[PDB]
Symmetry: D2
Subunit: 388 residues, 4 copies
């Protein structure tokens, strides 16, 4: 009756996660670098399904086409020896000083062109490795001051970039879709497309909207004090949840990247409840950082905890929905009615329906209790395994 | 060389603003109620262009069709005697206990139908009074707990409601457009369509998207720690800025509704700069609350301050853009290049362009300073009128 | 193996909590008023230990000395019939319009004098009913603008008020201590003594510091994004934790007053762990509001949930500390060393200790892992009852 | 009629400020390192009064006693050639991996002893260079998880450390005082002594409280959503404002370290108003970071802007207080009464004063307007130089 993960659970990790050396804005690294091959081997042993990477994680910046080839080959052999897959890949358009003002929206045009070329080159490699989703996190797209960036022009440049990438994949005949990852701030004072909503609205203005979805991250939405499960529900509603990044965050402050389960525990429960209920079948990707206080043993314990926590919550959420007492409580709170159309009878019928206004007893309706507190306590008991 | 407003400036106020009695969650009212006619007369004298209202502001809840008529007539006479217009109207779907779980997304179906009827009835009246925009603020659409609301079903109910209203105006042949007003939280723990982005994405899923835009509020986006000017830029970019609510907020906390100019002053400057540059021609509506510490004299001084502050900032922003030294600074920071297409030459040309990657000198590009701090200090000097 | 509370658990509730009618800044009441006697009877049945009140909760504002007497008598009989105690009392210096600019720090001197008299009168009554702690929440002490309040003068007025109350209790020979309750904002834009720290520092400037402590509230510190357990640890460290208010809050936003256990669940666990470990023996007081969506059945279910959640967490925290595997993990993370003095040998010895600097192997020390992630996952397993 | 600074203005900068290379958690450095001598020379030319440093800024970590001497000598010559002073110094107890779990509160005892030795060594050097204040920012004192740090034990270790440093300076006969710099979070999940209040309360528990004060930073308090001017007022009230760090922050998010004047402009105005009114005579120290988008020209423009903004605000604040119309407004709002004792007549007199309760006309007092909005608009006009 434990919680051991298997590749069937689709848990994935970025190379940059367990490979984070611990360098923060106020301190040097506390851990030596990991060879991508060792990370692949270590994660496979923990039960992971696959890994993800930024170009610069796999092939050091400025590498020769041959060195590049050696790096890819070694990586490939490790995937072969372990059965690990690579479901997603992304580009590093934030580390090098050249991207200090952005990649796709840098004020310098020559920088923008370079950003597009670097991305296109990695898209080819991502397809080669079997990736189905290509993520784009515009970490440097934004500003610290108001006159430094004209946002309308920036959005034109952002759209131009994404349309060109869409023109490329469709002309190469690749079966890869894009996922935009929003973040409200950090490293820039304010980042463009700050939340899942802004990203979703942006996509509807692209030439080929069908190729783009979102890759929301638990901590990012929480940095704006937003309800993550709700944001995900809207993304699923729009049919745009192509991928998802899981981790923990303790409120509005810098991006902590704690292991999944840490941070807002109740939000994690409602998240798992939703993903499992909605039948999300994409990867359960962890974009986290084992704290710099830890040594390598601590790194792997942190990675294992991510998966363990998701499995415990999945169990608790399933028991919650399957509890007949909860099913009756959901009806007591009228969740069944929320699912029924307000007016399937039509506009005219509604306007002619005296029970809807003229003869509506507003006071009687008002006095009805929603019974939400009883339902929420049942949810609490289930989460804590306190159903007596 | 002062800052006196005239109806030409299009400043408008909600009846509920200067009419706020001062009742908060911890205290009773500190001011007597204002008769809507006195508010109209007082605002006209201050230089306002018009007023806005919720049905329940103009006609007390539960009023008879005749009493209702008397109220409307008196209101009309005042508009006639002062030349004040009514450019926007909205529905109160949050005050009465019956809307405790929402209006359009209440779990109770009968409540949802009642919400739609109450709105439709006020839409007729809004057209009668000359309103061009009908705002919808779903203040009660949301939840305090996770199992109380299935967000996918709620969004279906929300879409159903808006589609029906769109079917109504188009069948009556009204020339009125809708504007959704987002808010992240308060009075509900979490409100649906929490920011401008979520609202924009939602609109693209409606049957007739052209009838809907957004009505963003300065303080609402700031309650999520977001950059208001940026949110507005995206709304303008999408061509969805139908109306706008101005006020002040001091960070992430309860909705303060301070007078415009108060709160984040630099954000207000960049907001006015953008609205004036973009040629926004809609009303400059103030949705604020004169603090409960004030008597009536203080109320009008607060209302007058709203307009005064907008006029001072408009002047400073105009002087900023017109300063040749600022124009050269904008070029030094490459704002001119941000406005130029990244690749008007096309995909193939980009892929064949060696100057874009193979021969791109990343180090030389990286060493270029953006000169953003000099530009921002010029912006500061202009705002403070310290250009020496 | 359930979680039923008994008066031995010292759980208490404010009359204003289960008695909250549901009126918020955007809506009317959804519940009828409760007679204080019914609340006492209902809470006793749930297993509560006692109740608390503001003067204005028990005796309506403006009541005659006789009516006042009738109210107190009825209240007394109910306490007698149920065995319920009244361990704390407080003053309402925030509701009436006269306190719009504060009570003890109102700019108007006559208001300040009135505030002191109203408090003194209720202190006599609190002693009469057996209260041991008198709480002071300066909800109106603060400002929305910078020039409205000179904070140095305000702090002089605040100190003057508290010193006078201290002079009163000591001259009447009462055995009652004061507890200041901080809150960062709401209803004022910014409230004086915004956090537990500011309150603690203030107390050290009073004439008789021994008579004053703090009454921290879970949600208040969380409104400033602070770690509640840490704030409590500092209050205990200083020996100033006289009382405590428990509830739930979901981050930085308006004061939600959710039932205890809701909001930040992990913070609640670490809070209970600390209170039980430290041997806190004061009341476990709930200052919450059953959401306005609920009817009376929902009110009592919410109140019962408060106590249930505290009892489940107490169990989980106890099992955590008692787990030998956790005890070894605490040693692996060097919590035992944190408890040992850094230099009991003294300054001179430290300066002459070459192993402390000259011969200190900084690299070897640096490479030691803290093992915090393993320890935190054990804490997680225990909380979720997932120890396999 | 400009705003040129002179050493008389007491503006100081940390070497680490204009010397920040631009490395953030997501990117490499964008600027080459500055030699401390060039920074001293450059700042002197801008009109600065002096500089400050962390040991590790001046003498590279791991330097030999001789190399150390060469570094100090060169630094000294530059101070001599420019007339620049060094009013404050501090220790770097956060960068090196050995301090990953803290310096004074690290769980490892040997690390704590090493932290104390490193500090003591730099205290000697700070005195040698003429520093009057020694700052302590416990950037690594805290935790990411609840069981990793027992806060009561940590506070004992923190007190032990500070007492030992106090025993050292008093035994060496140094004329140097300490200033604790609070910060709520970053780089640790939660930092001990998170705000000015927690630091002030802590100091009162030290053996020799007179040797310790606070060194508040604009951005730090704003990271907890607190009112900076209010925090400063309380620190001045307690006589503990030994030093102050100025910069800009845009709300609750990562520590931006923008130049002074940027961020919350109105808060900066009220801050300068208070410091100048209170007669603060200590240094006006800038702890900021010129954004990584800038080259060296941009660095110096950013540094110059810090001082320019403080001088403009000082002018506007002075004109505000000197305006007879503002003086009358302050009386209209009863600021004069806030400054008068509530009860200089004493407790007994208050209790016998019928005008204070029995015969107090609460309704008449309640109806008095505070006139705060008019006063705040005058403050606004003055700030914007819009007094017509």
């Amino acid at each position: 009756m434990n919680y051991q993960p298997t590749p069937e659970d689709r848990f994935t990790f970025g190379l940059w996660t367990v490979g984070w050396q611990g360098r923060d804005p106020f301190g040097d690294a506390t851990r030596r670098a990991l060879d991508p091959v060792e990370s692949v081997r270590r994660l496979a042993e923990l039960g992971a399904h696959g890994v993800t990477f930024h170009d610069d994680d796999l092939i050091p910046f400025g590498s020769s086409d041959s060195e590049r080839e050696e790096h890819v080959k070694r990586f490939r052999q490790a995937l072969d020896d372990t059965g690990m897959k690579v479901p997603m890949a992304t580009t590093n358009l934030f580390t090098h000083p050249v991207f200090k003002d952005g990649g796709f929206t840098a004020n310098d045009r020559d920088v923008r062109r370079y950003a597009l070329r670097k991305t296109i080159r990695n898209i080819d490699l991502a397809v080669e490795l079997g990736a189905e989703t290509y993520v784009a996190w515009g970490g440097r797209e934004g500003a610290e001051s108001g006159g430094a960036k004209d946002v309308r022009d920036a959005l034109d440049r952002m759209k131009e970039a994404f349309d060109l990438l869409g023109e490329y994949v469709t002309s190469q005949g690749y079966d890869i879709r894009f996922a935009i990852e929003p973040k409200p701030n950090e490293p820039r004072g304010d980042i463009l497309l700050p939340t899942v909503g802004h990203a979703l609205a942006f996509i509807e203005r692209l030439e080929r909207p069908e190729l783009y979805g979102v890759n929301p991250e638990v901590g990012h939405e929480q940095m704006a004090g937003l309800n993550f499960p709700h944001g995900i529900a809207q993304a699923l509603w729009a049919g745009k949840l192509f991928h998802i990044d899981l981790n923990g965050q303790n409120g509005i402050k810098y991006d902590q990247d704690l292991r999944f389960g840490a941070g807002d525990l109740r939000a994690a429960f409602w998240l798992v409840d939703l993903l499992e209920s909605a039948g999300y079948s994409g990867p359960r990707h962890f974009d986290f950082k084992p704290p710099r206080t830890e040594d390598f043993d601590g790194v792997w314990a942190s990675a294992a905890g991510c998966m363990r926590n998701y499995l415990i919550l999945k169990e608790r959420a399933a028991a919650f929905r399957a509890d007949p007492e909860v099913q009756e409580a959901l009806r007591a709170s009228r969740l069944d009615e929320l699912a029924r159309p307000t007016a399937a009878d039509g506009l005219q019928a509604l306007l002619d329906d005296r029970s809807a206004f003229e003869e509506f007893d507003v006071d009687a309706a008002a006095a009805r209790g929603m019974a939400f507190e009883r339902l929420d306590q049942l949810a609490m008991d289930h989460l804590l395994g306190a159903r007596g």
